[PDB]
Design a protein around this ligand. Structure first.
Ligand SMILES: [Mn+2]
Ligand SMILES: [Mn+2]
Ligand SMILES: [Mn+2]
Length: 425
DNA sequence: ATTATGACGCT
């Protein structure tokens, strides 16, 4: 009872830009705004592959990882913006720079963990305490939460429901108790409204957000009310929310482990996990995953918000699928040089902006007909930011997968160069 | 033949 800690010590938010690459292109080209549109990579094979879809286009069924020519069959008015091509490959620079604009704004409010190009986690605990002291017992007005949903409410027109749920929540609030977790989540959500208003003011970009007590719940909440909304998931709402949440919807259970939870335990929903003891879960899924599942199904997770705004590795990848696979020495050399040239550019920019050098070069390849996504991965030193040297070293490090007697066999379906092991410069 | 990245666990 009194000693069963409930993991309500922290206020954590997950901010995620709505259809991020599409918004970046829509800011740049007003003719795309408020339209069914999508962002693609390449154009020759089937119109190119869609990696980002506006909500207007999604309403027609257009999804990521879909071919543009197929999307056009669902949505013939679909507008398409194309990723930049440099040295014969996709160049995502525009989106990395847009991402940095957003991250730098978020960083003004609290310490952030960059979780992907378009999303970050925020530890708001200190911010909420400061703000709660600032109110001096003053109650929280619905006006301060104009885009916030309270998950699970109302109980007992879309905006009409949102406001009812918010009203129920605020009326039930204990504003004098500066230690109530629900009050803390609420103040956290006020701050997140402010953060999202500043992001939209200063970039033009809209985003959604989740506010809860840990990373997994913040992330799951962010997705409940997209786009351009934020959702507060309280500790108390977890039992009902999880009672019908498919296990695969939880961060990190979307794959094989989640499938084995479902198969081994004979269950479907997150809530069913509560009926197992911790030892039972550790037995089936190992001691780490077991402890983590035993606390997660009760709404409790301790993974911290890491103070890390910048990527820990800088990478350059190109697939050579089908008949385009690289089959000669000259080919592998030229593409290693193109990849190494983009890598050099990004690394030099990184060293000047962020005062750090990478010290290790990771070369990964896929060979044709190999089942694995990484047929091989080998590392070597990264000592100077010179593309010719980096490409030569990647060759040097991979050339003994060539089984020819100036040819390359098995032909290469993927090259990948990754700079890692950063040290302050 | 969606591609292009990137974090992190396991051993
Ligand atoms: Mn997003
Ligand atoms: Mn997405
Ligand atoms: Mn995202």
């Amino acid at each position: 009872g009194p000693h069963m800690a409930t993991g309500q010590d922290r206020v954590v938010a997950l901010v995620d830009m709505d259809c991020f690459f599409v918004q970046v292109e829509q800011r740049q080209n007003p003719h795309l705004r408020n339209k069914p549109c999508a962002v693609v990579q390449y154009k020759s094979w089937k119109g190119g592959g869609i990696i980002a879809v506006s909500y207007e286009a999604r309403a027609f069924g257009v999804t990521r990882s879909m071919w543009a020519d197929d999307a056009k069959k669902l949505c013939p008015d679909l507008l398409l913006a194309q990723v930049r091509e440099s040295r014969g490959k996709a160049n995502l620079t525009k989106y990395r720079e847009a991402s940095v604009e957003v991250m730098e704004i978020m960083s003004r409010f609290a310490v952030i963990e960059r979780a992907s190009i378009d999303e970050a986690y925020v530890d708001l605990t200190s911010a909420v305490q400061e703000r709660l002291q600032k109110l001096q017992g003053q109650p929280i007005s619905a006006d301060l939460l104009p885009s916030t949903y309270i998950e699970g409410l109302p109980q007992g027109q879309k905006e009409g429901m949102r406001k009812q749920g918010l009203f129920q929540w605020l009326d039930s609030l204990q504003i004098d108790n500066l230690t109530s977790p629900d009050l803390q989540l609420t103040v956290g959500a006020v701050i997140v409204e402010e953060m999202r208003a500043a992001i939209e003011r200063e970039t033009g970009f809209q985003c959604s957000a989740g506010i809860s007590h840990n990373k997994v719940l913040a992330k799951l909440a962010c997705g409940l009310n997209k786009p351009n909304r934020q959702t507060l998931v309280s500790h108390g709402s977890v039992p009902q929310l999880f009672s019908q949440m498919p296990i695969r919807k939880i961060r990190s259970l979307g794959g094989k482990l989640g499938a084995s939870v479902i198969e081994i335990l004979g269950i479907e929903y997150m809530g069913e996990l509560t009926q197992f003891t911790e030892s039972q879960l550790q037995s089936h899924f190992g001691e780490k995953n077991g402890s983590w599942l035993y606390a997660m199904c009760r709404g409790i997770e301790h993974d911290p918000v890491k103070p890390r705004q910048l990527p820990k590795t800088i990478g350059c990848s190109k697939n050579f699928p089908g008949k385009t696979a690289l089959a000669t020495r000259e080919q592998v050399q030229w593409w290693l040089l193109q990849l190494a040239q983009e890598l050099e550019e990004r690394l030099t920019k990184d060293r000047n902006d962020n005062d750090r050098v990478a010290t290790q070069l990771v070369v990964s390849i896929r060979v044709q007909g190999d089942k694995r996504l990484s047929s091989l991965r080998r590392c070597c030193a990264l000592t100077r930011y010179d593309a010719h040297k980096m490409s030569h070293d990647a060759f040097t490090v991979i050339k003994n997968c060539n089984t020819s007697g100036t040819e390359w066999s098995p032909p290469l379906t993927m090259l990948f160069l990754c700079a890692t092991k950063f040290s302050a410069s």
